[PDB]
């Protein structure tokens with residue numbers, strides 16, 4: 354049983370896609386925050402696949418208990434594939450989460466949703482360019498026009514933890530990359546190896562939730578703190594700001610290639 358998780362911003366069209374894929378009629382509304390819990394269903398054309406609808410999230414640092422549900426499902430390691438639902442009309446803001454999803458180590462497939470709206474706006478995205486520079490498969494989809502839905506499933510089904518080798522992660526400023534390496538060494542086996550890069554960056558961000566979940570040793574905590582301090586001194590900038598700006602810097606470069 355292959356497990357696909359529907360991840361992406363609220364109001365991006367995850368449930369709309371879920372209903373088409375499974376045959377269900379789950380609640381779909383034109384405002385952020387409709388889905389409030391996990392909903393499972395089998396993929397109709399290939400029953401070996403189980404797909405999970407989940408509440409929308411803006412990032413992997415949640416706010417609502419609804420946002421937590423989606424995060425907790427991914428971090429429990431239950432997902433074999435991340436089907437990242439992306440609103441193409443607001444690509445830059447949507448990809449902020451995407452970078453974090455690749456970092457979790459669960460192979461990401463992008464449903465570049467709402468492509469029909471984008472075609473109305475007269476704008477276009479070079480799908481293959483966006484795919485190359487992001488290191489993930491991308492499929493232009495429309496839940497309204499019912500285009501590209503089967504193809505995005507097919508690609509997600511074939512981009513799993515058991516079909517994909519070495520994963521290409523978003524490469525940031527080399528100075529932060531040096532800091533990430535040092536945190537990875539410090540972490541060791543305290544996290545699953547697949548998700549190590551995700552946790553390492555979150556620990557650099559000094560994310561409250563991740564810090565509490567991990568319960569690191571006094572020696573790990575002390576070294577990570579020294580690494581942050583030094584990197585802050587090097588970047589002439591606070592840790593939280595370094596990452597936020599590095600993600601958007603990475604996204605801006607990618608969107609220039611694609612748009």
Ligand SMILES: Nc1nc2c(ncn2[C@@H]2O[C@H](COP(=O)(O)OP(=O)(O)NP(=O)(O)O)[C@@H](O)[C@H]2O)c(=O)[nH]1
Pocket residue numbers: 362363364365366367368369370380381382383384385386387388389407408409410466467468469470494495496497498
């Ligand atoms: N034009 C257009 N509209 C779409 C498309 N996909 C979804 N929508 C519309 O966008 C709105 C949100 O869809 P929905 O599936 O509820 O999004 P969601 O990601 O499940 N929201 P949430 O995460 O809060 O549950 C709905 O009004 C839906 O009809 C699309 O591809 N094109």
Ligand SMILES: [Mg+2]
Pocket residue numbers: 367368369380387388406407408409
């Ligand atoms: Mg939904």
